[PDB]
Enzyme design. Structure first.
Site, mmCIF file in Angstrom:
data_model
loop_
_atom_site.group_PDB
_atom_site.id
_atom_site.type_symbol
_atom_site.label_atom_id
_atom_site.label_comp_id
_atom_site.label_asym_id
_atom_site.label_seq_id
_atom_site.Cartn_x
_atom_site.Cartn_y
_atom_site.Cartn_z
ATOM 1 N N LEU A 1 0.874 -1.162 0.000
ATOM 2 C CA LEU A 1 0.000 0.000 0.000
ATOM 3 C C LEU A 1 0.917 1.218 0.000
ATOM 4 O O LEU A 1 2.138 1.096 -0.120
ATOM 5 C CB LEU A 1 -0.964 0.024 1.204
ATOM 6 N N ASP A 2 0.339 2.399 0.158
ATOM 7 C CA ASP A 2 1.132 3.600 0.362
ATOM 8 C C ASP A 2 1.405 3.784 1.849
ATOM 9 O O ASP A 2 0.573 3.461 2.701
ATOM 10 C CB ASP A 2 0.422 4.836 -0.204
ATOM 11 N N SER A 3 2.597 4.300 2.148
ATOM 12 C CA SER A 3 2.988 4.485 3.538
ATOM 13 C C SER A 3 1.924 5.234 4.317
ATOM 14 O O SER A 3 1.600 4.847 5.442
ATOM 15 C CB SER A 3 4.321 5.224 3.626
ATOM 16 N N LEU A 4 1.358 6.288 3.733
ATOM 17 C CA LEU A 4 0.306 7.013 4.429
ATOM 18 C C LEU A 4 -0.863 6.097 4.771
ATOM 19 O O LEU A 4 -1.506 6.272 5.811
ATOM 20 C CB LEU A 4 -0.163 8.197 3.583
ATOM 21 N N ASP A 5 -1.133 5.094 3.933
ATOM 22 C CA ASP A 5 -2.259 4.206 4.197
ATOM 23 C C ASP A 5 -2.014 3.331 5.418
ATOM 24 O O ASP A 5 -2.906 3.182 6.263
ATOM 25 C CB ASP A 5 -2.529 3.348 2.967
#
Ligand SMILES: NC(=O)c1ccc[n+]([C@@H]2O[C@H](COP(=O)([O-])OP(=O)(O)OC[C@H]3O[C@@H](n4cnc5c(N)ncnc54)[C@H](OP(=O)(O)O)[C@@H]3O)[C@@H](O)[C@H]2O)c1
Ligand code: SF4
Ligand code: SF4
Ligand code: SF4
Lengths: 208, 176, 114, 80, 309, 152
Positions: free
Chosen positions: D37-41
């Site tokens: 996923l994306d780190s922010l996710d």
């Protein structure tokens, strides 16, 4: 020459040579240039390091009082390679004089707040963060004054086309007062006034 | 020099302190003025009874615009493009183009009447002495589609009274 | 480049920071969405926040990533309070503005030379 | 205060979001060398296990979790 | 010829005219021509001051007003002579104590289907309704389906429109409900059977016109307006009380502008969903809008805060 | 039949003969409003009593310059006013903005924000072309509320 030409006065120009001679004498870690404006005012070119330091020396002494801070401001110059500028301006109540303190900067390099030295740079530093973008650290508060809540451009610098990027208009299709890109009813004509021949010889730029 | 105000001390003796205790408790002051200085209503009112009577002015007044013409008319404006170029607000808009005989005149001349800030910079730059701020506050129409002026609105609005205008300048032109 | 950084040092404490105030936004979208009496699907309010934080992605540097924050750290002052009246907020989600073509042949029939 | 307390709560949550993990509810999931996923996710997941069950993760903790193992375990030694 | 960008203070080459355009619908169309640039000549009947709330709609020198009656065959001939497209929303609810209502869907839409056809308008337009059928119903709903027959004769190119029951902001359709604080909600007629119609949201209809306003290639070819999904329940009348938590009038009051114990009660339950084969919407699209999400906005009552729906 | 059109020599003479104007001070133009209520040209007692609260008014007045941050405030206030409302702008900055018309942070024109009726033109209108801008608005009620009920 006399009748229409402003009569000069020398005495004021002798002392402000002296008294400014030696504030390049006793703080050479900081001050990098000093001069005398032909109208009897001083400009002290100071590295960005001393700001809290130098004033603090100007803050109290028996030979230089400079208690009254009058005008903080800025100027923003492209092709100075360090964009902006500060100019502090201070009145010493006992000795009747004005001595201005010029300190350069950039956008990214922070400058340090003067707020504990004088409590009247409280507002004048909140403002500049809005307009030019200079960022003053360790400031009891940093917020948005003189500008709306939407301007993301920091206007007074030289890249903001005069009319901002969003005109405003209200429509009844819902409720609100909403923002549509700027569409004028007149061009804002650009006239061109700058005439040739270089009427000023004294300021003549280097020969090159 | 100086002065010192609100620097005084009470006298503190029983000939005085009655005079300040005949004041708090008997209201001998505070009826001095507004028992009186208010009435004092018996002066004649000052009102300019408006729809009829009107107030003073001076020959240098500023207001609704005009374009004169000499005796038998030349449309005094030569379109030298000045009253346009000193205009702070940039209301003026001028487009010349050579008239049939070959003497030059205008075509479009538009003073916006919202932008004009009423300088007195366009009365004072015209060398041939055409454009002139009239002394008539006739105004206030109901649609902003209007106040923009064309040329051929102005001339009439400046030939409706030239008995007003042509008799002011000859009071005022000897000063400047 | 030699100048003192602002808060961060390199990229980590920095990218601990952007992770951080995300939640202050993520935890508070909706308390407003009932407070201004503005009506939207509360999940929109969690799409935009995550739509913006993914926007400026290519930033190579400290003192930039700290600069953007100082903006972002502010807004939570105004919005978590009421210094805006409905119409400084909703301007994020542009309701009225007719779409831009962004494709080719849709341009060529409307507008000169963009 | 049961290992049936903290394995029940965790494992359904990760399913409940509408995004990537499709029944990787195996307790190891290692996040982006794993599923991705994306780190922010990943920084979204941390929060809903706190408002639920009560908790904080104030600190650099959320950066190291990387797996419902550690989160369960870091919760395990936390509460009991 | 269109210039520049569509923001405001632009051109986009179309003139228009919109008759009516005071009450609920017409006000809400012109507001979409006071944006993309136009020349919208809006006439109006009797109302000097009720038309002002409109004026900050076109920029400056765009919309322009006239005065007309409409039974005078000149008043429609003085304006339209310069026009491109002209739509027509005219007509209303209850029979007037003055206008006998019979031909105001017949003579009026033709009275403006006079020299408009002659004088060289184009893309003339008119309104229909999803439920109007020339079989016997309904005393008001009838005479409307006559225009589809009677008037279509003239101007072979129309693209006359057929939308559903619409719910706006200030609209009177879904607002007749929730004004029903009363001896009690009594459905029509005390039956939960055939509700409800296709409740499309007023934006999509008013975005249809200006999507056909230069379409191109829809003239003569009539369209009808899809609702959202799908038909609907009785719950719509419960839904009102689910969230609601239970021009030129007068100086004092109006004698009669009632609930009309007449067609009104039976016009709302006539339902009759009708022919799908009309193109009629996505082709003219792209628009369709739901109900459940857009019905909080228009409904705000004495709690004014709680929702939890 | 004829009673209505004789009735509007009452109700259309009542609303024009008592006005309760709000004012907006913002900019220079406010001072040449005050001198309309100072005794020289005496605004009140010629039928128009001066400022009241937002709720009780009829004719609001815009002076001054309208920046961005003031627009969200005005449009709200204009609403709450009762029915028989008007908007009379004045000054060269409510007409298209004086100068500042090219600035970034000034709305251009204040017709844009509301349906404005009467205008007046110049940095300060001379405290005269004010009142002669109202004796337009007391003559701009020739309208009749007849011929809406009573024609259509
Ligand atoms: N398509 C739909 O969904 C739908 C739904 C309901 C009704 N309708 C009918 O389709 C049209 C939509 O109208 P609407 O939504 O805008 O509501 P509306 O209130 O009927 O709007 C009509 C406007 O035109 C005026 N008017 C009434 N009779 C007139 C006449 N003979 N001549 C000129 N103007 C007249 C009305 O009062 P003034 O004369 O003072 O201007 C009103 O201002 C109407 O014909 C309506 O009866 C359609
Ligand atoms: S009046 Fe003077 S300035 Fe104005 S146009 Fe004629 S010449 Fe040029
Ligand atoms: S009147 Fe004042 S503003 Fe209008 S043009 Fe002449 S100078 Fe410029
Ligand atoms: S124009 Fe009217 S409003 Fe704008 S500044 Fe001069 S006075 Fe104040």
């Amino acid at each position: 020459t006399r009748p229409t030409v402003r009569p000069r006065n020398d005495v004021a120009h002798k002392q402000l040579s002296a008294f400014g001679e030696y504030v390049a004498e006793i703080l050479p870690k900081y001050v990098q240039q000093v001069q005398v404006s032909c109208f009897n005012e001083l400009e002290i070119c100071i590295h960005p390091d001393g700001v809290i330091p130098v004033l603090t020396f100007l803050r109290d002494h028996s030979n230089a009082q400079f208690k009254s801070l009058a005008d903080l401001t800025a100027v923003d110059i492209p092709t100075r390679q360090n964009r902006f500028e500060i100019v502090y301006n201070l009145l010493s109540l006992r000795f009747n004089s004005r001595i201005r303190v010029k300190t350069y900067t950039d956008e990214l390099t922070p400058i340090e707040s003067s707020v504990p030295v004088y409590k009247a740079a409280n507002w004048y530093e909140r403002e500049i963060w809005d307009m030019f973008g200079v960022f003053f650290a360790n400031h009891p508060d940093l917020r948005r004054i003189l500008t709306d809540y939407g301007f993301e451009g920091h206007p007074f610098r030289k890249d903001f086309p005069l009319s901002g990027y969003v005109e405003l208009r209200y429509d009844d299709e819902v409720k609100r007062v909403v923002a549509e890109p700027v569409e004028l009813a007149q061009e804002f004509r650009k006239f061109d006034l700058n005439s040739p021949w270089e009427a000023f010889p004294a300021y003549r730029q280097p020969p090159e | 020099t100086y002065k010192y105000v609100n620097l005084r001390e009470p006298s503190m003796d029983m000939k005085s302190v009655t005079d300040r205790a005949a004041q708090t408790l008997l209201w001998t002051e505070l009826i001095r003025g507004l028992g009186m200085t208010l009435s004092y209503l018996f002066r004649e009112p000052a009102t300019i009874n408006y729809p009829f009577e009107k107030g003073p002015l001076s020959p240098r007044f500023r207001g609704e615009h005009a374009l004169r013409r000499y005796p038998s008319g030349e449309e005094r404006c030569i379109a030298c493009k000045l009253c346009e170029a000193v205009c702070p607000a940039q209301a003026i808009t001028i487009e010349a183009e050579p008239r049939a005989d070959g003497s030059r005149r205008t075509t479009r001349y538009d003073i916006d009447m919202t932008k004009c800030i009423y300088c007195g910079f366009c009365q004072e730059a015209c060398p041939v002495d055409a454009i002139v701020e009239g002394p008539n506050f006739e105004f206030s129409t109901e649609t902003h589609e209007e106040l923009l002026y064309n040329k051929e609105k102005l001339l009439n609005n400046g030939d409706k009274w030239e008995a007003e205008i042509a008799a002011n300048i000859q009071a005022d032109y000897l000063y400047r | 480049t030699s100048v003192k950084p602002i808060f961060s040092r390199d990229m980590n404490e920095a990218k601990r920071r952007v992770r951080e105030l995300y939640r202050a936004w993520y935890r508070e979208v909706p308390n407003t969405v009932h407070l201004f009496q503005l009506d939207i699907s509360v999940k929109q309010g969690r799409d935009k926040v995550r739509e913006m934080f993914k926007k400026n992605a290519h930033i190579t540097d400290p003192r930039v990533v700290d600069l953007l924050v100082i903006k972002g750290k502010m807004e939570l002052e105004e919005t978590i309070k009421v210094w805006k009246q409905r119409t400084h907020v909703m301007r994020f989600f542009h309701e009225t503005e007719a779409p831009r073509p962004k494709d080719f042949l849709s341009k060529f029939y409307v507008g000169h030379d963009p | 205060l049961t290992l049936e307390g903290i394995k029940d709560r965790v494992l359904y949550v990760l399913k409940l979001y509408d995004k990537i993990d499709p029944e990787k509810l195996s307790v190891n999931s290692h996040f982006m060398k794993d599923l991705g996923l994306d780190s922010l996710d990943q920084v979204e997941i941390i929060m809903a296990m706190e408002d639920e069950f009560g908790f904080e993760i104030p600190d650099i903790d959320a950066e190291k979790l990387m797996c419902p193992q550690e989160i369960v375990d870091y919760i395990a030694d936390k509460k009991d | 010829i269109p210039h520049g960008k569509g923001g405001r203070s632009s051109v986009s080459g179309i003139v228009a005219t919109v008759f009516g355009a005071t009450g609920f619908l017409g006000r809400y169309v012109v507001n979409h021509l006071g944006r993309m640039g136009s020349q919208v000549i809006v006439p109006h009947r009797c109302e000097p001051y009720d038309t002002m709330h409109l004026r900050p709609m076109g920029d400056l020198g765009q919309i322009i007003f006239m005065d007309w009656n409409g039974r005078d065959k000149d008043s429609i001939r003085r304006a339209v002579e310069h026009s491109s497209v002209v739509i027509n929303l005219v007509g209303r609810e209850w029979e007037t104590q003055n206008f006998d209502f019979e031909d105001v869907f017949v003579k009026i839409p033709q009275a403006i289907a006079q020299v408009s056809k002659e004088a060289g308008v184009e893309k003339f337009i008119h309104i229909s309704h999803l439920n109007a059928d020339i079989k016997s119903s309904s005393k008001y709903l009838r005479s409307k389906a006559v225009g589809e027959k009677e008037v279509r004769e003239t101007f072979p190119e129309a693209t006359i429109i057929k939308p559903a029951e619409i719910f706006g902001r200030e609209d009177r359709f879904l607002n007749y409900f929730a004004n029903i604080r009363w001896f009690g909600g009594v459905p029509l007629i005390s039956l939960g059977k055939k509700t409800v119609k296709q409740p499309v949201y007023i934006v999509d209809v008013t975005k249809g016109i200006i999507n056909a306003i230069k379409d191109p290639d829809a003239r003569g070819k009539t369209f009808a307006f899809v609702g959202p999904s799908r038909y609907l329940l009785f719950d719509l009348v419960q839904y009102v009380f689910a969230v609601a938590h239970r021009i030129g009038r007068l100086f004092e009051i109006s004698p009669f502008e009632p609930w009309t114990t007449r067609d009104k009660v039976e016009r709302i339950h006539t339902t009759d969903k009708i022919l799908p084969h009309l193109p009629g919407l996505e082709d003219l699209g792209v628009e369709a809008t739901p109900l459940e999400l857009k019905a909080i906005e228009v409904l705000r009552r004495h709690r004014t805060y709680r929702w939890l729906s | 039949e004829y009673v209505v059109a004789k009735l509007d020599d009452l109700i259309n003479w009542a609303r024009r003969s008592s006005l309760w104007p709000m004012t907006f001070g913002l900019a220079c133009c406010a001072v040449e409003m005050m001198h309309m209520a100072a005794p020289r040209y005496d605004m009140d007692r010629f039928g128009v009593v001066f400022r009241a609260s937002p709720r009780q008014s009829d004719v609001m007045i815009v002076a001054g310059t309208l920046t961005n941050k003031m627009a969200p405030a005005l449009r709200k206030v204009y609403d709450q006013m009762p029915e028989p409302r008007y908007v009379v702008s004045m000054g060269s900055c409510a007409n298209g903005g004086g100068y500042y018309h090219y600035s970034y942070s000034v709305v251009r024109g204040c017709d844009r924000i509301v349906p404005v009726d009467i205008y007046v033109p110049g940095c300060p209108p001379t405290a005269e072309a004010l009142l002669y801008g109202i004796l337009q608005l007391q003559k701009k009620i020739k309208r009749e509320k007849r011929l809406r009920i009573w024609y259509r």
